[PDB]
Design an enzyme around this catalytic site. Sequence first.
Site, PDB file in Angstrom:
ATOM      1  CG  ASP A 181      -2.182   0.822   0.992  1.00 19.64           C
ATOM      2  OD1 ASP A 181      -2.360   1.349  -0.125  1.00 19.64           O
ATOM      3  OD2 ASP A 181      -2.999   0.927   1.930  1.00 19.64           O
ATOM      4  CB  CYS A 215      -5.910  -1.399  -3.843  1.00 24.85           C
ATOM      5  SG  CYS A 215      -6.297   0.364  -4.056  1.00 24.85           S
ATOM      6  NE  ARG A 221      -2.309  -1.114  -2.764  1.00 26.69           N
ATOM      7  CZ  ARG A 221      -2.483  -1.866  -1.687  1.00 26.69           C
ATOM      8  NH1 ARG A 221      -1.773  -2.966  -1.490  1.00 26.69           N
ATOM      9  NH2 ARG A 221      -3.390  -1.507  -0.783  1.00 26.69           N
ATOM     10  CD  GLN A 257      -3.372   6.294  -1.814  1.00 30.55           C
ATOM     11  OE1 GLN A 257      -2.848   5.181  -1.758  1.00 30.55           O
ATOM     12  NE2 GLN A 257      -4.154   6.769  -0.851  1.00 30.55           N
TER      13      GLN A 257
END
Length: 287
Positions: A181, A215, A221, A257
């Site tokens: 993550d 995700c 992701r 992100q």
Amino acid sequence: PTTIEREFEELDTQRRWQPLYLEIRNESHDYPHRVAKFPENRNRNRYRDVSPYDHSRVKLQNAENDYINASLVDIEEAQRSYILTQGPLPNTCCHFWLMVWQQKTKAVVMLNRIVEKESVKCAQYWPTDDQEMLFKETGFSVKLLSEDVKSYYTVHLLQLENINSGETRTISHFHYTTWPDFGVPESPASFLNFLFKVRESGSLNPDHGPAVIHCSAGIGRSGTFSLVDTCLVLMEKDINIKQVLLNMRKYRMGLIQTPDQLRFSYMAIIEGAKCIQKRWKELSKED
């Protein structure tokens, strides 16, 4: 040298990956997401700061509450459409499968582990053995038919049954298990080998409903996967990755992100543009 490869070296040598990501952050349009903030929907959101926009959210048809944290991302220029969603909660697993049924989805692409760094990121929404998994709120059951275990991903063959009508469909569940993550895959080869494995199944073709990509939050992701695949489809028909990402962000907030995920997307797109698939499979060390 391609236009994309020229831009990639300019960003790397001048270290402009972080201001480029800030530019995308600053240029990202905000859209209403009122339904996600309804008090009745609090227990349907994994994260308070990740919500689907009202105009692009997937609706659960005929349910009492039609809300699920899921966004339909359309790219008409690529004839591509994805559903990006969060990792289902224990109480929204039934909604997740109701959405898969109603949208005629053929593939579920899962880019997260169930637990990551002492935290549960996703409920166990498919069975791991031969016991049937029941979802009585929406009237569905899921069975594990087969599973193909590779070194860094597993493909589960699932049977999605409407327990009321008896109809069943086969669902291909592609599980990427080595993608941290807020992080990146091991290499462009391993990611591209996984992506083309999804593509080779035919589950992304127009003769099927939109694939469900998820995700943890469904932005990081999941945004990387969808951005590379969309740009590769377009590059087939010069693409502006920045504009493609911004346009995709009009359908779901916060896709990609970190600046590193953006940089990796560029690398995967450049390496994917050569299509070599056999070379990726060997470099991925999938077997």
